[PDB]
Amino acid sequence: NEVLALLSRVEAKGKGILQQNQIIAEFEALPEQTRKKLEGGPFFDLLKSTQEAIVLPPWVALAVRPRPGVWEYLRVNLHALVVEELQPAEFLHFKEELVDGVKNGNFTLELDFEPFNASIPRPTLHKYIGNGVDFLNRHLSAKLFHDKESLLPLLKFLRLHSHQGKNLMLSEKIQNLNTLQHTLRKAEEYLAELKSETLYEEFEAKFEEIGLERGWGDNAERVLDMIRLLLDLLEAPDPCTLETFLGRVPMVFNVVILSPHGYFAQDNVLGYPDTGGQVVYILDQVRALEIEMLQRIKQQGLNIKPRILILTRLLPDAVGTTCGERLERVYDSEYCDILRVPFRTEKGIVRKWISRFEVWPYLETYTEDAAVELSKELNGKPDLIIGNYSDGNLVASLLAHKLGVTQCTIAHALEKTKYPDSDIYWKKLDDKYHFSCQFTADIFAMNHTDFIITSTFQEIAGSKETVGQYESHTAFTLPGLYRVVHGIDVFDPKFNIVSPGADMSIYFPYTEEKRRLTKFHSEIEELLYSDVENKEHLCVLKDKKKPILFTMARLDRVKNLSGLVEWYGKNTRLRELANLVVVGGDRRKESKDNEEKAEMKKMYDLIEEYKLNGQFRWISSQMDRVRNGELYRYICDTKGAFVQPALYEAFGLTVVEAMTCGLPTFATCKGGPAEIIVHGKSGFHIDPYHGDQAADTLADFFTKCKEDPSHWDEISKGGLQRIEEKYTWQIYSQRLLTLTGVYGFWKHVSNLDRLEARRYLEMFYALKYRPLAQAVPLAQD
């Protein structure tokens, strides 16, 4: 039936040459179509699952996403009955024509990682997405089952394994699978007799003779399960055994964590440009991690002192902060230190703060210096290196290569999703955002790392209707630069979802009075309710008795706080039900940041346009997490809500913070918060793209709550439970240390195939990144 499909198509052309999201997609076409739709049926789905249509005049190219991870591309005539199948490169061809006027030059670069990944097969099942360590365990387990050449790497691994001059596991005496099999069995028999609680020092003497070094356990009971696991791996390997053994072998002692950009510190930084949850995340991470490391070290019978170093930039001139000092102890830990190294050039060190978009030229030299410094602090090399965001992941990759260390990366966000069509439009965006440098770093670190941690499933594969953050890096193009035909694969065994949490000492339910910090209420009240207008707070709240609609964030475009302010301003119904309180930007000082500056001006104007004085209180960055905990609980007291109107949010720690304090939450459905909140149960989703519907949705909530206050309680409890179930730090660290064990081993087994990819990546860095980065204009002191 061609009279119909041509209906939609002729409507497609009516739009003119440009990109169209499924946002528009059928919006303009199928629903916006005349009642003649009468479709359902075939070709409705094909269009329903269409992620984007690139429309140029004769043709429209369609990218179709049947399942997460599965993609087919199609060209169909604007006027015709014809439908042809595009190869990914060919569809990327369409995009390039839409922008440059021409497809990229014949011999212009195609990035393809697919042929480099043929080492392990790949899962086709939705269940292994973000689950890759499970798949890997099952592959290793099989590859290991009665293969002498397969088991050897394990023996060599345990044989060479050591820390700070001291030998661990097997000694040099065990040279072959037989001797090992024999020693284990002999050792098993000896211990099987002894009392469970016998300390390793008793049988230490005996073990050393037969070739066993320390780290099997603190006492005989533990050592026995350990030695039995290994006998089991040499006999009949299965995944649970494998994972347990590898996760248990003490490995991680010295950890190195990379976060170069922003002002990274424990006080008076939160909410400055570039300074946000990534800092909050890491500080929570190290503490949870140190606790777990000590625990492990002890259990395996070791006295080793751990060290965790967070490498960031030293900022000499940032005053009111500790950013200018080389070494800083992380609060509430023995072994975690922030290590700070300066950016520098041939001219000497660079003093001023630099935006995260501008740091690229300094990253390589930073890697060199960082290597020297961490090497002065550590005893022995790093056992694990974790990259964070783009610059951190970049540096993390170089260091891991340099030092021969298991690497992990964490994106914390991927700009390509936050700035829609920033890939295809990169050129016009480059003087400002330098996304050519950044998308290069990302693609690079993504493939270079050993394993990857994400905060949610959606960060990888998205949902049924919409594409994930990484998934969107599978096929893209930067016209005039290069074309990524397969840049990453959602099914990659290196992806692991491990969810973060909020420090439970800082954020707890507002209902526990014993724990409420009331010593903060005077300050909070001045902050919320005072009549003073200054750099700390703008306008004033007329009625202190209303519920408060609250948000807190860095102030930039994507965070879209000026959007919220507008939605709020237009809607009389909502302004009547609730006061709007927004924490963002720091007005105490001169903003050096582009987006922030821009956003500040919009805020001012909105205040005048919608005459917001008396309903609205605009607060400066709140840098003390302890008082913030209380602030959230205070919002609860007023029976209000948290709202997060980001155009895109990669994860959203404040969403978790609010829910954890019992504050009912309305969060953007674009990005992580879609997975975090279960609509109508643990909170509500709103669409930043329809803000008036958002404001009405909030007005609705507050109206119901007024009629039936128990409505409020439902959501509050809903959120509280959701957090308890999904996001908390206890499991995280154990999960991470286990992945490091398994991926660490897999490194040596898979070492020979990754050799080509290693060289390919080295060249990409050298001949693509470096030149791009050197083109970025230097900061001038």
Add this chain to the structure above:
Amino acid sequence: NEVLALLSRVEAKGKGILQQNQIIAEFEALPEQTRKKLEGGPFFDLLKSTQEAIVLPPWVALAVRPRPGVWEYLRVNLHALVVEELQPAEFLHFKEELVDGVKNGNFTLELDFEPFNASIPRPTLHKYIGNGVDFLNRHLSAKLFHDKESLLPLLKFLRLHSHQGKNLMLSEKIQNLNTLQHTLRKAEEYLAELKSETLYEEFEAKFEEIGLERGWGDNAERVLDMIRLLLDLLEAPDPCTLETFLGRVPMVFNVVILSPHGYFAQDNVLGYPDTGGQVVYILDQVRALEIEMLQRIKQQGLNIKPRILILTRLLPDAVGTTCGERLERVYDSEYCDILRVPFRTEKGIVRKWISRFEVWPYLETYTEDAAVELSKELNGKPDLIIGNYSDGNLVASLLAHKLGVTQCTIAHALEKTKYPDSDIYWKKLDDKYHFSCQFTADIFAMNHTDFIITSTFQEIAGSKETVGQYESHTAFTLPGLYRVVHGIDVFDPKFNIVSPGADMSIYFPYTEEKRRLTKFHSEIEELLYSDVENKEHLCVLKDKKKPILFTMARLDRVKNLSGLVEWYGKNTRLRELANLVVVGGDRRKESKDNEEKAEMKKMYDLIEEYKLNGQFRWISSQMDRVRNGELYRYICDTKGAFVQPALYEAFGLTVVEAMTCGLPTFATCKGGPAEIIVHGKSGFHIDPYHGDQAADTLADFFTKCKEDPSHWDEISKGGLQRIEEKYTWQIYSQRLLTLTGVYGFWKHVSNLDRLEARRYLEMFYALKYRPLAQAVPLAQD
């Protein structure tokens, strides 16, 4: 020898910080040493296998070459007993350090092709160097043996195989090994009944029913052997069967040869800058190749008209030549044409000749234009593409990539060997030679091609004492640009030695009188013996009865004609015995080539310095091979000899020409002629680095010949038999076409592993070659 060994190192530090070459790095050290040698002990063996030694402060680094293609690097302490093994990358550090003062940036490019080549096992045997098709034959032979997933590709090959819309071998009626097996047997039974001479047309009707298309053979007999061959590969594959069948399948019809630089023509060219044996080789090659292709096509029962196209630059302003016409029939062929295409920029075409060292920025646009043109000429696409030298290989690679055609490359020379230390010292050489472009292209094509042809073993692996031309490319560095850790491997199965020849109608023994061309004797005598001095010839021969010491060649630095002149000028013994005649340079015109100009100035000076008038005749470029043949023969008449005093010579076609006419030849021991000539038997070696001995050797030969004239005749016969045995064109074409058969099929089997290497090279071209080439300044018309 804690005493003795320390002692050599002693002298070593003497020469200071510098390059240590075997001659220097031994001849000085050990022979300028004392009787303290007593060196028939072990340390001398590793000592004399040292190819070069990097002299620095207290360390000296040694590259050691026990056997051809086997290298180990190490560092010894200048004053110390300690010697520590070095990785290839580390050895190359030293060189980088000795020049720039620092190593290359830690993260700057390191090329390693090793991991990309693992597809096949590699021969460790000297015997397989240059023999790789024999090796690939045994790999495929084995991979093929009772493996179904293995045999399918061969069936897909034969089924898909067609030319110009005409099906060949198997039709679509054969979908699987079972039916193929069944059909062949059926065909066999039928054919064995018929008379041997039965033409394919008779049984064609039947063959088409059972799925057999044309190309098995012209008669019953031949069709029978081919069918039996294939049945064999389905049953018991062996290397000989495999090779023979693959060589027999009609494949090569359209052939494209790439030779952009020089003035490429059939007359009024040879001896111009850049115009040389490459032009000669190619013209002979195509003729030989056409005769074989026609042969094959006939034998396999086909009427196809073949085409061979030689692609070169169109030069509109080169007068006296055919170089400005687009299409030129090659003398003595029906199907071979020269196809010229212009260089151009956005500004339009570029008219003026450009030195082979400067062509780089034009090649990519050249490739595009050339694809358009050769597409107009060919009916169907190229079945084979052959690259020639650096530019030709660069373009051939782009083409084969673009058109999906089997690719061969032929180096014809590798400048890195011709210009010692031009890699390490490349930077100061670059404004003139652009070796950064060239070496990049060479490494690029070298790894990109399917198979490589060389003219001699030495060209690949050299000798026991000296390093091969390609081999010298295994590990090197260009400080400040990049470093090649493994760039090529002498044991690579793609290397094939296929030796060229001299056209036998042009060059033949001086003793066959019926054939001598006497009508040229008037001209020749004027050339050598006349008293006129002009741009055609300089100075004069006083005594017409002396033997002549003859050389002919392009005039450039490496050809070292000026060296010969000096050796001759100094040596009174030789001047007395013989007249020196040198053909090189075209003085008829004003030289546009740097080295030529430089070299002319020296020649003039040498004439006056050594007062060469009356013993010396300097002749301008002799451009007609027909008379040239007679020229050689005329030298023989005088009982003279040929001398090739090159500092390095990649092959030496003139050596073959000379030997083929019965002219006793003295050729440089550096490069190819070392293999061509067997000293004392088929000719003599001379060392351009000791020139005075060169002149004495010549002197000795002439002296002995004066005493015993049969000495001359002895060497003459040596040369002739030598040529007869090794270098002739008859075997060449068959060899080439069999290689295409075998490497063509290998393409389809090995396709998946070379996919990784394909991306690596693609990225290397894009990100390394293009930027370099775009930096070479353009010619200005």
Add this chain to the structure above:
Amino acid sequence: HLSAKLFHDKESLLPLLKFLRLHSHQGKNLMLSEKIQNLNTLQHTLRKAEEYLAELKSETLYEEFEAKFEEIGLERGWGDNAERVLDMIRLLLDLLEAPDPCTLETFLGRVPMVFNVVILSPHGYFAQDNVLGYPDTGGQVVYILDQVRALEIEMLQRIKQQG
């Protein structure tokens, strides 16, 4: 099939090494000595041997180089003279590198192996005269008599040629 199984499989070559390693007759060792425990050493030894031999005149008798070979792990049975010892060592190198059916057959054919042969023909009246035509006594007896004569000649020929 052997040519294939043999191509670049270490595990698959070991059998060949062991074969030539144990091979001996009447207490005298043949081919490889006990000195060679692995393929790398054999590779190296065969290499060294080839090099040494290539220099000596074709007609040089084994005893000359017997001393050296003994040193490096090479026992007798390679050939009578240098020329033949050379060809045989090359064949073996070839099998270690790129095994093919012709080379395998040729090398295994040439290894001195068969010395004592035992032939079974129990029934009939088996003899050289006054037998043929008797019950059960016929072409089989004729066959075996011709057979052994021919065999003996070839065996002597082979034994001599292998040194």
